[PDB]
Design an enzyme around this catalytic site. Sequence first.
Site, mmCIF file in Angstrom:
data_model
loop_
_atom_site.group_PDB
_atom_site.id
_atom_site.type_symbol
_atom_site.label_atom_id
_atom_site.label_comp_id
_atom_site.label_asym_id
_atom_site.label_seq_id
_atom_site.Cartn_x
_atom_site.Cartn_y
_atom_site.Cartn_z
ATOM 1 N N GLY A 287 36.024 94.246 -6.863
ATOM 2 C CA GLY A 287 37.071 93.671 -6.055
ATOM 3 C C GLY A 287 37.836 92.492 -6.666
ATOM 4 O O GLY A 287 38.648 91.889 -5.996
ATOM 5 N N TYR B 123 45.330 82.375 -0.035
ATOM 6 C CA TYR B 123 44.784 81.012 0.063
ATOM 7 C C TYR B 123 45.743 80.156 0.893
ATOM 8 O O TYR B 123 46.918 80.079 0.561
ATOM 9 C CB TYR B 123 44.628 80.414 -1.349
ATOM 10 C CG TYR B 123 43.648 81.214 -2.150
ATOM 11 C CD1 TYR B 123 44.000 82.445 -2.653
ATOM 12 C CD2 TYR B 123 42.359 80.759 -2.383
ATOM 13 C CE1 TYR B 123 43.101 83.215 -3.315
ATOM 14 C CE2 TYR B 123 41.464 81.516 -3.107
ATOM 15 C CZ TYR B 123 41.838 82.760 -3.521
ATOM 16 O OH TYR B 123 40.984 83.550 -4.249
ATOM 17 N N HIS C 76 36.510 75.569 -13.255
ATOM 18 C CA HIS C 76 35.963 76.908 -13.500
ATOM 19 C C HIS C 76 36.821 77.733 -14.495
ATOM 20 O O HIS C 76 37.968 77.429 -14.819
ATOM 21 C CB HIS C 76 35.850 77.738 -12.208
ATOM 22 C CG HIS C 76 37.169 78.106 -11.618
ATOM 23 N ND1 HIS C 76 37.999 77.172 -11.055
ATOM 24 C CD2 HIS C 76 37.859 79.263 -11.649
ATOM 25 C CE1 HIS C 76 39.125 77.753 -10.711
ATOM 26 N NE2 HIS C 76 39.056 79.025 -11.055
ATOM 27 N N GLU D 255 37.478 82.143 -14.765
ATOM 28 C CA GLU D 255 37.452 83.195 -13.765
ATOM 29 C C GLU D 255 36.200 83.993 -13.945
ATOM 30 O O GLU D 255 35.565 83.930 -15.013
ATOM 31 C CB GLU D 255 38.675 84.108 -13.988
ATOM 32 C CG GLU D 255 40.010 83.385 -13.802
ATOM 33 C CD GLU D 255 40.095 82.802 -12.401
ATOM 34 O OE1 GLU D 255 40.025 83.593 -11.365
ATOM 35 O OE2 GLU D 255 40.163 81.560 -12.310
ATOM 36 N N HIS E 172 40.087 75.518 -15.616
ATOM 37 C CA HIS E 172 41.102 74.911 -14.832
ATOM 38 C C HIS E 172 40.546 74.417 -13.470
ATOM 39 O O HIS E 172 39.475 74.826 -13.043
ATOM 40 C CB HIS E 172 42.289 75.873 -14.633
ATOM 41 C CG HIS E 172 41.913 77.147 -13.945
ATOM 42 N ND1 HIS E 172 41.367 78.203 -14.631
ATOM 43 C CD2 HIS E 172 42.061 77.560 -12.664
ATOM 44 C CE1 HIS E 172 41.102 79.185 -13.783
ATOM 45 N NE2 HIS E 172 41.514 78.818 -12.584
ATOM 46 N N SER F 42 46.712 85.517 -5.057
ATOM 47 C CA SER F 42 46.135 85.639 -6.403
ATOM 48 C C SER F 42 45.290 86.887 -6.593
ATOM 49 O O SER F 42 44.979 87.580 -5.604
ATOM 50 C CB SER F 42 45.313 84.396 -6.784
ATOM 51 O OG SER F 42 44.201 84.324 -5.948
HETATM 52 O O1 LIG Z 1 44.680 78.149 -5.685
HETATM 53 C C1 LIG Z 1 43.416 77.936 -5.817
HETATM 54 O O2 LIG Z 1 42.720 77.331 -4.974
HETATM 55 C C2 LIG Z 1 42.612 78.395 -7.028
HETATM 56 N N1 LIG Z 1 43.213 79.333 -7.951
HETATM 57 C C3 LIG Z 1 42.678 79.640 -9.127
HETATM 58 O O3 LIG Z 1 41.776 78.983 -9.683
HETATM 59 C C4 LIG Z 1 43.308 80.792 -9.797
HETATM 60 O O4 LIG Z 1 44.398 81.232 -9.273
HETATM 61 O O5 LIG Z 1 42.841 81.194 -10.904
HETATM 62 FE FE LIG Z 2 40.882 80.105 -11.096
#
Ligand SMILES: O=C(O)CNC(=O)C(=O)O
Ligand SMILES: [Fe+3]
Length: 338
Positions: A163, A170, A181, A183, A269, A281
């Site tokens: 998935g 978000y 982190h 991914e 990031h 995302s």
């Molecule tokens: O928007 C967010 O909270 C987190 N997003 C990420 O770490 C991503 O898109 O790789």
């Molecule tokens: Fe991320």
Amino acid sequence: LNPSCKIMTFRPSMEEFREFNKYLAYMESKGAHRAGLAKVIPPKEWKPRQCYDDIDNLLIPAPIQQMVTGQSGLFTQYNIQKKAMTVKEFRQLANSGKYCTPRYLDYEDLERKYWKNLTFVAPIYGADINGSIYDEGVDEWNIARLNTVLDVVEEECGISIEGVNTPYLYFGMWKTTFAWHTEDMDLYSINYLHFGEPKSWYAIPPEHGKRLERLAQGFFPSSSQGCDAFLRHKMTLISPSVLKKYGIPFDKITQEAGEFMITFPYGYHAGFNHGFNCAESTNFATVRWIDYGKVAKLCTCRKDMVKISMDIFVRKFQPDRYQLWKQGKDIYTIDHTK
Ligand SMILES: O=C(O)CNC(=O)C(=O)O
Ligand SMILES: [Fe+3]
Ligand SMILES: [Zn+2]
């Protein structure tokens, strides 16, 4: 080439923009991946959704209140699950006095305020909601179906992608955190900010990812002792002031409504939301990811975590190395610039 490994921003024309896969190859040909993160601002005529008013009715089933502990640029976070609410209710809460963005001068001033106020009121986040909010028929940069090599092996070879190549929504409010982190399976990600307030991002070049882990291990030993890949729990916050002091290179950029951010393999990031907002995302991969996947250091300590078998990717796209790899003898150091 991008030798400073600084975060690049792309402003494609409509004709450049149409084909995502092709435009990503183009970004990499200009050294975008060296910074671990890049911004793509679509041309102003492109709108993935005509009207966002209906999104007010979307249910957020499981809002998370983020409980941050620590000080002096070093923190750990845990989550408390709250009662379901609509996006409308969430926005009204985000915009209240208790939760709203503070007064600020500029983005740098707001950044200082985020780091200084992290352990006062606990912000609430809606994350990991399944679904895309693009209109039907939008075929450009459609996060629900980007058609990368993950979809190829899922669809032609029956391999499970767990998935990670499906869309997530978000909903942020001021001060909501995304902690340090990379991914799952050190994949790529893409993040479109649909509407609302900006999201600030930090990124560290993949060539310095092991330096960041070493520092995190020193400042969070208990967490480190518990799990070989503890940053994957996304509960570890480390300020730009601390990175600078310990010589970890990084960059920062602010993503505004209507812009894409792309994270690259093993590009650490983190970041924070400026106020009420909505982002979409997913994760994806390219052939260059395969060598990262093969060596991704995984969370040992909870059976739920995402693991994708690399066998099919090696067999199909690195057929000259397959045998060697199946013997445990395909040993290399990644060149993060290539
Ligand atoms: O928007 C967010 O909270 C987190 N997003 C990420 O770490 C991503 O898109 O790789
Ligand atoms: Fe991320
Ligand atoms: Zn773990």
